[PDB]
């Protein structure tokens, strides 16, 4: 079960809670790389180029 | 300006809409935070939807 879109925007600021998390600011754009774990998604920041986990209810489709 | 549901959602509160993946909506108010007021184009019903569950057509 996945998302039909792949380009997302942060609705809120987020501070990484673990080394493999991204930190990000509201407005930051992402490409989603793996949504299959549900609550946590792997994403690429389109600002930093970095890959890591984001909380899936912090982002919405652009 | 149509939006489409990416996922099914089962709402358990009075004012929130339930909907199915693919259901189409007109957005009525996105100004009040991340729950938007919308009209379902299936039922004609208005209520709130979580804005991360829909995308522009």
């Amino acid at each position: 079960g996945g998302t039909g879109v792949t380009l997302f925007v942060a609705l809120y600021d987020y501070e990484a809670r673990t080394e493999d998390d991204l930190s990000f600011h509201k407005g930051e754009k992402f490409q989603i790389l793996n949504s299959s774990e549900g609550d946590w998604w792997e994403a690429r920041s389109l600002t930093t180029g970095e890959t890591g986990y984001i909380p899936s209810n912090y982002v919405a489709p652009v | 300006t149509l939006f489409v549901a990416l996922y099914d959602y089962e709402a358990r509160t009075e004012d929130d809409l339930s909907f199915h993946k693919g259901e189409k909506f007109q957005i009525l108010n996105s100004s009040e935070g991340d729950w938007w007021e919308a009209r379902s184009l299936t039922t004609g019903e208005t209520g709130y939807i979580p804005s991360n569950y829909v995308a522009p057509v």
Binding site: - | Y7, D34, Y53
Partner: peptide, 7 residues
């Protein structure tokens, strides 16, 4: 206060 998608 948004739900997590059911992915």
């Amino acid at each position: 206060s948004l739900p997590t998608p059911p992915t």
